[PDB]
Each structure stands twice: as C-alpha cells, then as structure tokens.
Amino acid sequence: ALLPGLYLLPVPIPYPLKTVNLYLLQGAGEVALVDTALGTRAARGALELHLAELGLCFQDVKTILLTHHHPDHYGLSGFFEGLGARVFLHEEEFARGHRFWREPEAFAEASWRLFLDHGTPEETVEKTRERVHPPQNPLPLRDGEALEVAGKRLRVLWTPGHADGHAAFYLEEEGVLLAGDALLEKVSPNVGLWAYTRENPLKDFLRSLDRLADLGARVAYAGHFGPIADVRQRAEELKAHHQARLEALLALLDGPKTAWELSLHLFPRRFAFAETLAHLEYLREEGAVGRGGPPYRYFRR
Numbered sequence: 001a002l003l004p005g006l007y008l009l010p011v012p013i014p015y016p017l018k019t020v021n022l023y024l025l026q027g028a029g030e031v032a033l034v035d036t037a038l039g040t041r042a043a044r045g046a047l048e049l050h051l052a053e054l055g056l057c058f059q060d061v062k063t064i065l066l067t068h069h070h071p072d073h074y075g076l077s078g079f080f081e082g083l084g085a086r087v088f089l090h091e092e093e094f095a096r097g098h099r100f101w102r103e104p105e106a107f108a109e110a111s112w113r114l115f116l117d118h119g120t121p122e123e124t125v126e127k128t129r130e131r132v133h134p135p136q137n138p139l140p141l142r143d144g145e146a147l148e149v150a151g152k153r154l155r156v157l158w159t160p161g162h163a164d165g166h167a168a169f170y171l172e173e174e175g176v177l178l179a180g181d182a183l184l185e186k187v188s189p190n191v192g193l194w195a196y197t198r199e200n201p202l203k204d205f206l207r208s209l210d211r212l213a214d215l216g217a218r219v220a221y222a223g224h225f226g227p228i229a230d231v232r233q234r235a236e237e238l239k240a241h242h243q244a245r246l247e248a249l250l251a252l253l254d255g256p257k258t259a260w261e262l263s264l265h266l267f268p269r270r271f272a273f274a275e276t277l278a279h280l281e282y283l284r285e286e287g288a289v290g291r292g293g294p295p296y297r298y299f300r301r
C-alpha cells in the first residue's frame with residue numbers, strides 16, 4: 001500500500017523492460033486500475049493473483065485509466081471493457097496510437113516505409129497485436145481535467161513525447177504522481193518517432209519533463225522500475241541525458257549516415273531506431289543536421 005487504497009501491481013511483460021507497474025485504487029465503493037498490462041498467460045495470471053490478494057476479481061474493476069497506448073499499459077483495456085469497465089484514454093491517442101491498434105491497416109504501409117527509407121534492411125508487431133485487446137468505446141481525457149476515482153482526486157497531466165496522448169495522473173493533495181512512462185528512475189523512457197507520431201516528439205518530451213520538474217510532486221510512481229523520490233531531480237537528469245544523446249548523435253555524423261546504422265551506435269532494435277529517428281528530426285528542425293534522399297542519409301552541417 002503506497003497510500004491507503006493505492007497499491008503497486010508489478011506485472012511481467014515479454015519486452016526488454018520485463019515488468020510493468022500497474023496501480024490499483026480502491027475506496028468509496030469503487031475499484032480502478034491505472035494501466036492494464038497485456039494478454040499473455042503470465043501477465044493475466046499475475047494480475048489475477050494481485051487482485052485475488054486484495055479480495056477482487058477482474059469483474060470488480062469498473063474504471064480503467066490509461067497513461068498511454070503502448071501494449072504493456074493498454075493491452076488488457078478491451079478485456080476489462082468487455083466485462084463492463086469504463087476505459088479512459090487521453091484525446092491525443094485517439095487518432096494516433098489508439099487508431100494504430102483499432103485499424104491495423106491505417107498506418108501499416110507508412111510504418112514499413114519509414115523503416116525502409118531510413119536504411120532498415122529486410123513480425124514481432126503481429127505477435128504484439130495478438131496480445132492487445134483494444135477498447136471499443138474509450139472516453140477521451142483532457143489536460144487539466146479532474147477525476148474523482150475511488151475516493152481520490154486525480155489531475156490529468158498531458159505529457160506528450162513518450163507517446164502522443166501520454167497522460168500522467170496527479171494526486172494533488174498527497175503530492176503523489178502516477179507518472180506512467182513520462183518519467184523513469186533508471187533509464188530514459190523511449191522517445192520514438194513512428195508513422196502516427198506528432199511532428200517533433202523529442203521537443204514534446206523535453207517540454208513534458210519541464211512541466212513535471214516544476215510540478216512540486218513529492219514522489220512519483222512510474223510505469224517501470226522503482227519509485228522516484230525527487231521528481232524535479234530525475235526530470236532534470238533526463239533533460240541532461242537527452243542533451244548528451246544529441247551531442248553523441250552529432251559526433252556520430254562524421255559522414256552521411258542512415259537512421260538505422262546510427263541507431264546501432266547511439267544504442268550500443270525497433271525502439272532504438274525510432275528513438276534515433278526522433279533525435280535526428282529534432283536536430284534537423286533546429287537546422288543542425290540536414291538530409292539527402294530518400295533513401296534518407298543525415299549529415300552534420
């Protein structure tokens with residue numbers, strides 16, 4: 001129990017992060033989940049056992065609050081919805097990451113072309129899609145809106161970057177931030193440029209870190225790894241981290257290079273590619289780099 005009626009629920013995931021952190025809220029006769037893991041036997045089983053420990057079934061969870069559309073957070077939302085749960089998702093996900101799951105053919109060609117144009121040589125995504133149960137009627141959340149959930153009051157903080165409609169949930173009185181993947185303690189959360197992403201995802205991400213830095217939160221519980229005791233400090237560390245990565249990427253451009261080959265050294269794979277692309281497009285917008293093609297080869301001015 002992180003607070004009375006607020007519980008950390010670690011769930012195994014078949015991705016390099018290995019474990020996703022879900023948050024269970026119980027109170028005032030209500031039960032809610034922040035994030036849902038995904039449809040594997042190991043993930044479903046772990047979540048069931050967690051709920052059982054609290055005396056609950058899947059069917060007891062009537063409210064779902066999603067930080068973002070990534071499979072490790074969004075994967076079981078449609079399952080819970082099928083049992084009668086109400087699913088909440090930030091509005092900016094709807095035409096992007098949410099559409100990606102709902103309409104497999106909406107971004108398919110662009111997704112592959114983005115890889116190919118940026119030097120990727122000739123699916124795990126299909127395996128992922130099989131583990132994802134998209135909600136049919138999710139309700140759009142808005143930045144700054146206030147939710148009364150299980151006796152607690154949560155402020156919706158739109159924090160784009162890691163995902164377009166990424167939302168953190170902030171308990172203002174307690175100063176407790178449910179950060180999702182906008183902030184992590186050990187590594188940087190991915191900032192990837194995908195076919196459905198906003199124009200400059202890294203710029204969004206750094207502005208989101210600024211927003212969280214000035215928030216005044218007393219503690220952050222994120223989507224992965226351990227608790228974050230000093231939120232401003234970690235936000236400032238992730239700022240500095242990406243500044244170092246930008247400098248590192250500039251150094252790697254000793255000649256014209258593709259995003260694929262660059263991603264091997266900037267990250268000594270799919271996520272590495274998208275992150276590298278995000279950093280390149282940030283640099284290009286600033287004018288620090290240019291590109292020929294397609295096939296795109298980036299160079300340092």
Ligand SMILES: [Zn+2]
Nearest residue numbers: 068070162181
């Ligand atoms: Zn994520």
Ligand SMILES: [Zn+2]
Nearest residue numbers: 070072181223
């Ligand atoms: Zn995650």
